[PDB]
Structure formats: structure tokens, C-alpha cells
PDB file of C-alpha atoms and ligand atoms in Angstrom:
ATOM      1  CA  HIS A 291      42.568  20.977  51.914  1.00  0.00           C
ATOM      2  CA  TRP A 292      40.528  19.084  53.900  1.00  0.00           C
ATOM      3  CA  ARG A 293      39.225  16.589  56.438  1.00  0.00           C
ATOM      4  CA  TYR A 294      38.031  12.992  56.233  1.00  0.00           C
ATOM      5  CA  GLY A 295      34.262  12.784  55.823  1.00  0.00           C
ATOM      6  CA  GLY A 296      34.273  16.394  54.697  1.00  0.00           C
ATOM      7  CA  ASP A 297      32.649  18.013  51.681  1.00  0.00           C
ATOM      8  CA  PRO A 298      33.095  18.336  48.750  1.00  0.00           C
ATOM      9  CA  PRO A 299      34.216  14.885  47.549  1.00  0.00           C
ATOM     10  CA  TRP A 300      37.858  14.880  46.470  1.00  0.00           C
ATOM     11  CA  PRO A 301      37.238  14.772  42.682  1.00  0.00           C
ATOM     12  CA  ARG A 302      35.817  18.285  43.037  1.00  0.00           C
ATOM     13  CA  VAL A 303      39.140  19.662  44.275  1.00  0.00           C
ATOM     14  CA  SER A 304      41.429  17.184  42.466  1.00  0.00           C
ATOM     15  CA  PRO A 305      39.825  15.509  39.409  1.00  0.00           C
ATOM     16  CA  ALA A 306      42.695  12.999  39.275  1.00  0.00           C
ATOM     17  CA  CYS A 307      41.126  11.411  42.373  1.00  0.00           C
ATOM     18  CA  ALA A 308      38.485   9.985  40.006  1.00  0.00           C
ATOM     19  CA  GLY A 309      41.160   8.301  37.847  1.00  0.00           C
ATOM     20  CA  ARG A 310      40.860   4.633  36.886  1.00  0.00           C
ATOM     21  CA  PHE A 311      43.892   3.306  38.744  1.00  0.00           C
ATOM     22  CA  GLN A 312      43.512   4.546  42.306  1.00  0.00           C
ATOM     23  CA  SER A 313      44.510   3.246  45.738  1.00  0.00           C
ATOM     24  CA  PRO A 314      43.747   1.631  48.116  1.00  0.00           C
ATOM     25  CA  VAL A 315      42.331  -1.597  46.697  1.00  0.00           C
ATOM     26  CA  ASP A 316      41.022  -4.906  47.994  1.00  0.00           C
ATOM     27  CA  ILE A 317      43.661  -7.645  47.888  1.00  0.00           C
ATOM     28  CA  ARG A 318      42.374 -11.095  46.935  1.00  0.00           C
ATOM     29  CA  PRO A 319      45.425 -13.292  47.400  1.00  0.00           C
ATOM     30  CA  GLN A 320      43.828 -16.186  45.481  1.00  0.00           C
ATOM     31  CA  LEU A 321      43.756 -13.998  42.381  1.00  0.00           C
ATOM     32  CA  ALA A 322      47.200 -12.489  42.872  1.00  0.00           C
ATOM     33  CA  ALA A 323      49.776 -13.436  40.272  1.00  0.00           C
ATOM     34  CA  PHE A 324      52.866 -15.174  41.638  1.00  0.00           C
ATOM     35  CA  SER A 325      56.014 -13.610  40.150  1.00  0.00           C
ATOM     36  CA  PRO A 326      59.283 -15.374  41.030  1.00  0.00           C
ATOM     37  CA  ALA A 327      61.056 -12.208  39.794  1.00  0.00           C
ATOM     38  CA  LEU A 328      59.985 -10.446  43.009  1.00  0.00           C
ATOM     39  CA  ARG A 329      62.935 -10.732  45.408  1.00  0.00           C
ATOM     40  CA  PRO A 330      63.079  -9.878  49.117  1.00  0.00           C
ATOM     41  CA  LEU A 331      62.968  -6.141  49.802  1.00  0.00           C
ATOM     42  CA  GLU A 332      66.355  -4.553  50.528  1.00  0.00           C
ATOM     43  CA  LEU A 333      66.573  -1.717  53.017  1.00  0.00           C
ATOM     44  CA  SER A 334      69.600   0.220  54.216  1.00  0.00           C
ATOM     45  CA  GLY A 335      70.011   3.155  56.561  1.00  0.00           C
ATOM     46  CA  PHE A 336      66.755   2.537  58.470  1.00  0.00           C
ATOM     47  CA  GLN A 337      68.434   2.067  61.881  1.00  0.00           C
ATOM     48  CA  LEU A 338      68.553   5.677  63.021  1.00  0.00           C
ATOM     49  CA  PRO A 339      70.570   6.819  66.057  1.00  0.00           C
ATOM     50  CA  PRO A 340      68.818   8.548  69.000  1.00  0.00           C
ATOM     51  CA  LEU A 341      70.133  11.915  67.760  1.00  0.00           C
ATOM     52  CA  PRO A 342      69.435  13.970  65.728  1.00  0.00           C
ATOM     53  CA  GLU A 343      65.719  14.096  66.423  1.00  0.00           C
ATOM     54  CA  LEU A 344      62.891  13.774  63.891  1.00  0.00           C
ATOM     55  CA  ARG A 345      59.850  16.003  63.277  1.00  0.00           C
ATOM     56  CA  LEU A 346      56.532  14.393  64.241  1.00  0.00           C
ATOM     57  CA  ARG A 347      53.501  16.404  63.052  1.00  0.00           C
ATOM     58  CA  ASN A 348      49.728  16.272  63.351  1.00  0.00           C
ATOM     59  CA  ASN A 349      48.802  17.599  59.906  1.00  0.00           C
ATOM     60  CA  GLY A 350      45.051  17.032  60.364  1.00  0.00           C
ATOM     61  CA  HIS A 351      45.052  14.093  57.932  1.00  0.00           C
ATOM     62  CA  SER A 352      47.415  11.822  59.885  1.00  0.00           C
ATOM     63  CA  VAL A 353      50.439  11.915  62.168  1.00  0.00           C
ATOM     64  CA  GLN A 354      53.527  12.161  59.940  1.00  0.00           C
ATOM     65  CA  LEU A 355      57.170  11.426  60.819  1.00  0.00           C
ATOM     66  CA  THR A 356      59.814  13.169  58.685  1.00  0.00           C
ATOM     67  CA  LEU A 357      62.674  10.854  57.735  1.00  0.00           C
ATOM     68  CA  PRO A 358      66.316  11.953  57.313  1.00  0.00           C
ATOM     69  CA  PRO A 359      68.469  11.329  54.229  1.00  0.00           C
ATOM     70  CA  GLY A 360      69.973   7.928  53.587  1.00  0.00           C
ATOM     71  CA  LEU A 361      67.062   5.531  53.916  1.00  0.00           C
ATOM     72  CA  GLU A 362      67.460   3.412  50.797  1.00  0.00           C
ATOM     73  CA  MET A 363      64.863   0.940  49.594  1.00  0.00           C
ATOM     74  CA  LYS A 364      65.222  -1.459  46.655  1.00  0.00           C
ATOM     75  CA  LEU A 365      62.259  -3.242  45.057  1.00  0.00           C
ATOM     76  CA  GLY A 366      64.479  -4.963  42.510  1.00  0.00           C
ATOM     77  CA  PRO A 367      66.727  -4.304  39.516  1.00  0.00           C
ATOM     78  CA  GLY A 368      66.041  -0.797  38.223  1.00  0.00           C
ATOM     79  CA  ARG A 369      63.709   0.081  41.088  1.00  0.00           C
ATOM     80  CA  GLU A 370      65.515   1.981  43.844  1.00  0.00           C
ATOM     81  CA  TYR A 371      64.081   4.563  46.229  1.00  0.00           C
ATOM     82  CA  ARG A 372      64.746   6.854  49.140  1.00  0.00           C
ATOM     83  CA  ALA A 373      62.324   7.159  52.090  1.00  0.00           C
ATOM     84  CA  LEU A 374      60.753  10.580  52.719  1.00  0.00           C
ATOM     85  CA  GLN A 375      58.217  10.176  55.527  1.00  0.00           C
ATOM     86  CA  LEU A 376      55.860   7.726  57.190  1.00  0.00           C
ATOM     87  CA  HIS A 377      52.339   8.136  58.519  1.00  0.00           C
ATOM     88  CA  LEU A 378      49.382   6.062  59.678  1.00  0.00           C
ATOM     89  CA  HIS A 379      45.713   5.337  58.949  1.00  0.00           C
ATOM     90  CA  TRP A 380      43.298   4.225  61.650  1.00  0.00           C
ATOM     91  CA  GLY A 381      39.705   3.898  62.775  1.00  0.00           C
ATOM     92  CA  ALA A 382      38.024   4.681  66.071  1.00  0.00           C
ATOM     93  CA  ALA A 383      37.102   2.929  69.305  1.00  0.00           C
ATOM     94  CA  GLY A 384      36.158  -0.603  68.240  1.00  0.00           C
ATOM     95  CA  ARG A 385      36.184   0.265  64.540  1.00  0.00           C
ATOM     96  CA  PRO A 386      38.927  -0.678  62.040  1.00  0.00           C
ATOM     97  CA  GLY A 387      40.636   1.842  59.755  1.00  0.00           C
ATOM     98  CA  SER A 388      43.199   0.253  57.448  1.00  0.00           C
ATOM     99  CA  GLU A 389      43.126   1.465  53.837  1.00  0.00           C
ATOM    100  CA  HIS A 390      43.819  -1.766  52.006  1.00  0.00           C
ATOM    101  CA  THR A 391      41.550  -4.744  52.710  1.00  0.00           C
ATOM    102  CA  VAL A 392      42.199  -8.471  52.315  1.00  0.00           C
ATOM    103  CA  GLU A 393      39.289 -10.484  50.846  1.00  0.00           C
ATOM    104  CA  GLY A 394      37.060  -7.573  51.797  1.00  0.00           C
ATOM    105  CA  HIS A 395      38.135  -7.483  55.460  1.00  0.00           C
ATOM    106  CA  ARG A 396      39.485  -4.345  57.135  1.00  0.00           C
ATOM    107  CA  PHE A 397      42.350  -4.306  59.657  1.00  0.00           C
ATOM    108  CA  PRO A 398      42.656  -2.021  62.721  1.00  0.00           C
ATOM    109  CA  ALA A 399      45.257   0.316  61.173  1.00  0.00           C
ATOM    110  CA  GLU A 400      47.917   0.661  58.483  1.00  0.00           C
ATOM    111  CA  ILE A 401      51.369   2.211  58.186  1.00  0.00           C
ATOM    112  CA  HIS A 402      52.694   3.873  55.018  1.00  0.00           C
ATOM    113  CA  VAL A 403      56.354   4.644  54.330  1.00  0.00           C
ATOM    114  CA  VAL A 404      56.510   6.947  51.283  1.00  0.00           C
ATOM    115  CA  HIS A 405      59.556   6.855  48.986  1.00  0.00           C
ATOM    116  CA  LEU A 406      60.973   8.870  46.062  1.00  0.00           C
ATOM    117  CA  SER A 407      62.611   7.168  43.077  1.00  0.00           C
ATOM    118  CA  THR A 408      66.367   7.778  42.811  1.00  0.00           C
ATOM    119  CA  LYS A 409      65.603   8.812  39.223  1.00  0.00           C
ATOM    120  CA  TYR A 410      64.007  12.050  40.462  1.00  0.00           C
ATOM    121  CA  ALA A 411      65.476  14.840  42.576  1.00  0.00           C
ATOM    122  CA  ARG A 412      62.155  16.119  43.940  1.00  0.00           C
ATOM    123  CA  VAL A 413      58.613  14.827  44.573  1.00  0.00           C
ATOM    124  CA  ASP A 414      56.996  17.316  42.208  1.00  0.00           C
ATOM    125  CA  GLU A 415      59.130  15.923  39.356  1.00  0.00           C
ATOM    126  CA  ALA A 416      58.034  12.389  40.248  1.00  0.00           C
ATOM    127  CA  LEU A 417      54.297  13.028  40.667  1.00  0.00           C
ATOM    128  CA  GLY A 418      52.197  11.066  38.211  1.00  0.00           C
ATOM    129  CA  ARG A 419      55.236   9.445  36.598  1.00  0.00           C
ATOM    130  CA  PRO A 420      55.106   5.646  36.518  1.00  0.00           C
ATOM    131  CA  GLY A 421      57.357   4.385  39.311  1.00  0.00           C
ATOM    132  CA  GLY A 422      58.275   7.878  40.507  1.00  0.00           C
ATOM    133  CA  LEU A 423      56.912   7.254  43.994  1.00  0.00           C
ATOM    134  CA  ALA A 424      56.674   4.024  45.969  1.00  0.00           C
ATOM    135  CA  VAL A 425      54.880   3.220  49.205  1.00  0.00           C
ATOM    136  CA  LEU A 426      55.579   0.407  51.656  1.00  0.00           C
ATOM    137  CA  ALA A 427      52.419  -0.581  53.510  1.00  0.00           C
ATOM    138  CA  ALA A 428      51.787  -2.890  56.477  1.00  0.00           C
ATOM    139  CA  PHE A 429      48.662  -3.762  58.462  1.00  0.00           C
ATOM    140  CA  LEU A 430      48.569  -3.173  62.216  1.00  0.00           C
ATOM    141  CA  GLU A 431      46.617  -5.748  64.220  1.00  0.00           C
ATOM    142  CA  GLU A 432      45.778  -6.250  67.868  1.00  0.00           C
ATOM    143  CA  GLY A 433      48.081  -8.529  69.832  1.00  0.00           C
ATOM    144  CA  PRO A 434      48.634  -9.369  73.531  1.00  0.00           C
ATOM    145  CA  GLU A 435      51.965  -7.536  73.896  1.00  0.00           C
ATOM    146  CA  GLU A 436      52.902  -3.865  73.892  1.00  0.00           C
ATOM    147  CA  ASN A 437      54.891  -2.979  70.766  1.00  0.00           C
ATOM    148  CA  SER A 438      57.989  -1.180  72.036  1.00  0.00           C
ATOM    149  CA  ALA A 439      58.891   0.399  68.675  1.00  0.00           C
ATOM    150  CA  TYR A 440      55.445   1.902  68.188  1.00  0.00           C
ATOM    151  CA  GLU A 441      55.360   3.074  71.815  1.00  0.00           C
ATOM    152  CA  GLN A 442      58.154   5.516  70.924  1.00  0.00           C
ATOM    153  CA  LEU A 443      55.707   7.368  68.663  1.00  0.00           C
ATOM    154  CA  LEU A 444      52.391   6.649  70.388  1.00  0.00           C
ATOM    155  CA  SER A 445      53.678   8.047  73.690  1.00  0.00           C
ATOM    156  CA  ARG A 446      54.270  11.405  71.975  1.00  0.00           C
ATOM    157  CA  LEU A 447      50.811  11.850  70.405  1.00  0.00           C
ATOM    158  CA  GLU A 448      49.274  13.701  73.392  1.00  0.00           C
ATOM    159  CA  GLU A 449      51.661  16.635  72.953  1.00  0.00           C
ATOM    160  CA  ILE A 450      50.559  17.053  69.339  1.00  0.00           C
ATOM    161  CA  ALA A 451      46.837  16.436  69.886  1.00  0.00           C
ATOM    162  CA  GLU A 452      45.729  19.715  68.293  1.00  0.00           C
ATOM    163  CA  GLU A 453      45.758  20.005  64.511  1.00  0.00           C
ATOM    164  CA  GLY A 454      48.918  21.547  63.113  1.00  0.00           C
ATOM    165  CA  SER A 455      51.011  20.730  66.181  1.00  0.00           C
ATOM    166  CA  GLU A 456      54.488  19.253  65.967  1.00  0.00           C
ATOM    167  CA  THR A 457      57.175  17.908  68.221  1.00  0.00           C
ATOM    168  CA  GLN A 458      60.693  16.463  67.941  1.00  0.00           C
ATOM    169  CA  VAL A 459      61.329  12.809  68.795  1.00  0.00           C
ATOM    170  CA  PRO A 460      64.438  10.603  69.130  1.00  0.00           C
ATOM    171  CA  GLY A 461      65.642   8.659  66.118  1.00  0.00           C
ATOM    172  CA  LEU A 462      64.610   5.030  66.160  1.00  0.00           C
ATOM    173  CA  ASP A 463      64.851   1.868  64.091  1.00  0.00           C
ATOM    174  CA  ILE A 464      62.304   2.607  61.362  1.00  0.00           C
ATOM    175  CA  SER A 465      62.359  -1.039  60.211  1.00  0.00           C
ATOM    176  CA  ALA A 466      61.155  -2.091  63.687  1.00  0.00           C
ATOM    177  CA  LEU A 467      57.826  -0.441  62.712  1.00  0.00           C
ATOM    178  CA  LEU A 468      57.577  -2.914  59.825  1.00  0.00           C
ATOM    179  CA  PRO A 469      57.140  -6.707  59.625  1.00  0.00           C
ATOM    180  CA  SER A 470      60.313  -8.796  59.779  1.00  0.00           C
ATOM    181  CA  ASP A 471      59.409 -10.855  56.712  1.00  0.00           C
ATOM    182  CA  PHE A 472      60.712  -8.915  53.693  1.00  0.00           C
ATOM    183  CA  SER A 473      60.221 -11.834  51.316  1.00  0.00           C
ATOM    184  CA  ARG A 474      56.413 -12.188  51.228  1.00  0.00           C
ATOM    185  CA  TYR A 475      54.429  -9.258  49.850  1.00  0.00           C
ATOM    186  CA  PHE A 476      51.874  -8.063  47.299  1.00  0.00           C
ATOM    187  CA  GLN A 477      52.650  -5.421  44.690  1.00  0.00           C
ATOM    188  CA  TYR A 478      50.555  -3.336  42.307  1.00  0.00           C
ATOM    189  CA  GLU A 479      50.410   0.041  40.575  1.00  0.00           C
ATOM    190  CA  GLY A 480      48.030   2.670  41.955  1.00  0.00           C
ATOM    191  CA  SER A 481      47.829   6.203  43.344  1.00  0.00           C
ATOM    192  CA  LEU A 482      48.470   8.393  46.341  1.00  0.00           C
ATOM    193  CA  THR A 483      45.520   7.808  48.680  1.00  0.00           C
ATOM    194  CA  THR A 484      45.124  11.519  49.435  1.00  0.00           C
ATOM    195  CA  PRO A 485      44.791  14.517  47.121  1.00  0.00           C
ATOM    196  CA  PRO A 486      46.204  15.042  44.542  1.00  0.00           C
ATOM    197  CA  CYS A 487      45.758  11.253  44.076  1.00  0.00           C
ATOM    198  CA  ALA A 488      48.521  11.074  41.464  1.00  0.00           C
ATOM    199  CA  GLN A 489      48.804   7.703  39.690  1.00  0.00           C
ATOM    200  CA  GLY A 490      51.913   5.687  38.791  1.00  0.00           C
ATOM    201  CA  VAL A 491      52.646   4.849  42.450  1.00  0.00           C
ATOM    202  CA  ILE A 492      54.170   1.430  43.173  1.00  0.00           C
ATOM    203  CA  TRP A 493      52.458  -0.120  46.200  1.00  0.00           C
ATOM    204  CA  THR A 494      54.044  -2.961  48.167  1.00  0.00           C
ATOM    205  CA  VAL A 495      51.873  -4.482  50.894  1.00  0.00           C
ATOM    206  CA  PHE A 496      53.485  -6.871  53.405  1.00  0.00           C
ATOM    207  CA  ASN A 497      51.825 -10.263  53.838  1.00  0.00           C
ATOM    208  CA  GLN A 498      52.937 -10.355  57.488  1.00  0.00           C
ATOM    209  CA  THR A 499      51.318  -7.877  59.887  1.00  0.00           C
ATOM    210  CA  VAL A 500      52.593  -5.960  62.902  1.00  0.00           C
ATOM    211  CA  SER A 501      50.904  -6.261  66.326  1.00  0.00           C
ATOM    212  CA  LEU A 502      50.034  -3.466  68.764  1.00  0.00           C
ATOM    213  CA  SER A 503      48.289  -3.806  72.131  1.00  0.00           C
ATOM    214  CA  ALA A 504      44.615  -2.858  72.503  1.00  0.00           C
ATOM    215  CA  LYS A 505      45.715   0.122  74.579  1.00  0.00           C
ATOM    216  CA  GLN A 506      48.151   1.200  71.863  1.00  0.00           C
ATOM    217  CA  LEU A 507      45.524   1.009  69.109  1.00  0.00           C
ATOM    218  CA  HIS A 508      43.213   3.077  71.319  1.00  0.00           C
ATOM    219  CA  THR A 509      45.944   5.691  71.879  1.00  0.00           C
ATOM    220  CA  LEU A 510      46.445   5.951  68.115  1.00  0.00           C
ATOM    221  CA  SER A 511      42.759   6.502  67.318  1.00  0.00           C
ATOM    222  CA  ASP A 512      41.639   8.437  70.418  1.00  0.00           C
ATOM    223  CA  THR A 513      44.341  11.083  70.915  1.00  0.00           C
ATOM    224  CA  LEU A 514      44.485  13.367  67.867  1.00  0.00           C
ATOM    225  CA  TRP A 515      42.186  16.150  66.723  1.00  0.00           C
ATOM    226  CA  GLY A 516      41.692  17.202  63.099  1.00  0.00           C
ATOM    227  CA  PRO A 517      40.815  20.317  61.060  1.00  0.00           C
ATOM    228  CA  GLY A 518      38.183  22.611  62.526  1.00  0.00           C
ATOM    229  CA  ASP A 519      36.382  21.008  65.459  1.00  0.00           C
ATOM    230  CA  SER A 520      36.826  17.486  64.106  1.00  0.00           C
ATOM    231  CA  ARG A 521      38.230  14.323  65.662  1.00  0.00           C
ATOM    232  CA  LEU A 522      41.199  12.695  63.754  1.00  0.00           C
ATOM    233  CA  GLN A 523      39.521   9.313  63.355  1.00  0.00           C
ATOM    234  CA  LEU A 524      38.532   7.055  60.462  1.00  0.00           C
ATOM    235  CA  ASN A 525      41.262   8.655  58.403  1.00  0.00           C
ATOM    236  CA  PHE A 526      41.171   6.162  55.554  1.00  0.00           C
ATOM    237  CA  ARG A 527      39.990   6.308  51.948  1.00  0.00           C
ATOM    238  CA  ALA A 528      37.259   4.044  50.600  1.00  0.00           C
ATOM    239  CA  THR A 529      38.392   1.041  48.569  1.00  0.00           C
ATOM    240  CA  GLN A 530      38.924   1.788  44.858  1.00  0.00           C
ATOM    241  CA  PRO A 531      38.046  -0.413  41.853  1.00  0.00           C
ATOM    242  CA  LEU A 532      40.882  -2.535  40.408  1.00  0.00           C
ATOM    243  CA  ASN A 533      39.710  -1.876  36.858  1.00  0.00           C
ATOM    244  CA  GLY A 534      41.679  -4.716  35.273  1.00  0.00           C
ATOM    245  CA  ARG A 535      44.907  -4.292  37.215  1.00  0.00           C
ATOM    246  CA  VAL A 536      46.942  -7.287  38.338  1.00  0.00           C
ATOM    247  CA  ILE A 537      48.142  -7.579  41.918  1.00  0.00           C
ATOM    248  CA  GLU A 538      51.391  -9.558  41.972  1.00  0.00           C
ATOM    249  CA  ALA A 539      52.581 -11.757  44.852  1.00  0.00           C
ATOM    250  CA  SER A 540      56.220 -12.513  45.745  1.00  0.00           C
ATOM    251  CA  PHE A 541      55.279 -15.987  46.969  1.00  0.00           C
ATOM    252  CA  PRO A 542      53.249 -18.972  45.637  1.00  0.00           C
ATOM    253  CA  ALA A 543      49.850 -20.373  46.575  1.00  0.00           C
ATOM    254  CA  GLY A 544      49.864 -22.592  49.658  1.00  0.00           C
ATOM    255  CA  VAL A 545      46.908 -23.697  51.767  1.00  0.00           C
ATOM    256  CA  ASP A 546      45.895 -22.036  55.055  1.00  0.00           C
ATOM    257  CA  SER A 547      45.161 -25.445  56.584  1.00  0.00           C
ATOM    258  CA  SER A 548      45.303 -29.220  56.089  1.00  0.00           C
ATOM    259  CA  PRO A 549      43.325 -32.278  57.285  1.00  0.00           C
ATOM    260  CA  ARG A 550      45.183 -34.723  59.555  1.00  0.00           C
TER     261      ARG A 550
HETATM  262 CL1   CL B 667      43.123   7.063  34.543  1.00  0.00          CL
HETATM  263 CL1   CL B 668      37.194 -12.568  48.517  1.00  0.00          CL
HETATM  264 ZN1   ZN B 669      43.245  19.123  54.840  1.00  0.00          ZN
HETATM  265 ZN1   ZN B 670      36.292 -13.730  55.098  1.00  0.00          ZN
HETATM  266 ZN1   ZN B 671      48.874   6.908  53.609  1.00  0.00          ZN
END
């Protein structure tokens, strides 16, 4: 327990981090398998009122927002979850820091919303069990406009700049931190992307991205400090080998362009 870029490598402290079915991975949409069984995601309870407040913590690995009870997420028949927390992965000034890549390209940042299967009462019961945990992931890109939903969190980072600091923030619409298109996504089975790197995690990566302003992306990557004397930057894991896994897509092929 640990900092990005630190020593020793994770398999030394958690051998499961050297498992064969780890996350994140590179997504090659042309090789993804279209599955018409994959229906639009169904969320309920994500529109939180201003009160009560939520814990926002700099844990030295990321900034993590604790979510209240009642956030329900359904991936499909037999696959229902409750949200626990969300956190972010980012780079540094001018440098991207998403965890997943698309055709080998890295995005500025990435949001993760971590969920527990309704089949398990506690995380430690679910760890390593196929389908026990599920993560919703979206890429954050630069856009021309300030993202008002993200500003609610970004504006509070300065007060938790030092590692281990926390603060309380107003409830907000958690779905406003995610893309609006719930119908188009990729899905595969992998791992937690931090120790203990437990496998059996269902990953769902939105096809649509979310946009933050340049200033906002800078605030995210420039404000927080990590363990020891370190800067909380480049807090993403290297891409992991697919090792024969299939990435499914909830939508068919389609061309990016067409001649007149
Ligand atoms: Cl394995
Ligand atoms: Cl490629
Ligand atoms: Zn640590
Ligand atoms: Zn390319
Ligand atoms: Zn994460």
C-alpha cells in the first residue's frame, strides 16, 4: 500500500495482479463481438438530493466519492448491482491518463463507478467471484464547454490536496457524470485495476465519452498530492494482455465515414 510508479511491482505484494485476465485492456472495436442480447443499461436512484452530503476522499491512489444506498444498476437478466463508490484516473499536464485504450490510443482521463452484485452482502464475499463486482467506465475528453456536473467535484479538490484528506460535498446527479447513451457499450470480464487485482469483475465501457474543459482536466491532474512526497498524477495501470478473452459490443459494426 502504495503509490503509482512506486516499487516493488504489484505482483510482489499481490500475486493475483499477475493473473491472466487482468484489467485494463485495449479495446479494438473491429474485433469486438456484437451481442444483440446486450440491452441498454438500467439505472435507478442515481439522482441524489443536495442533502445528505457525501464523503470525498484523497486516498493517495485517486479521489474517491462514497455513494449512499439505493443506487441500482442492471446489466441484464440475472445481473443486478448496487453502486458503492466512484473514482477517477488521469494523467498530467499535457499527458493522457485513461486506463482503457481504444485501438491503442489513450484518453485524457477515465471515471469508474464500482458496484457490488445483489447476490453478495459485502465486497469481501464478492472478491474474485465471477460477476461479484461490476465497474462502469467512461472516458473523459477535452471539449470547449465547462462540465457543470464535474465542476461540483473538481471545485472541491483543493481542500483535499494532501494525501488522506477528506471533505463532505452536496449530493448530485451521479448519472450526469456519465454519458447519456446507455445503449452503446463494450463489455468484458477482467479484474480490479488496483491491488488486490481480483478477477471475475464485469467491465462495461461506454462508447460515448464525456467532455470536460481544458481547465477542468488541468484541475483534476494538477491539484492532488499522493503518498509520501509524491504528486497524484499518472494514476493509471498499464494495459494488460487480453489472453484470448472476447470483448462484446452492444451495437453492430457501422462505418466511421462514407464517400459522397
Ligand atoms: Cl488467472
Ligand atoms: Cl488497432
Ligand atoms: Zn497506497
Ligand atoms: Zn489510430
Ligand atoms: Zn479505477
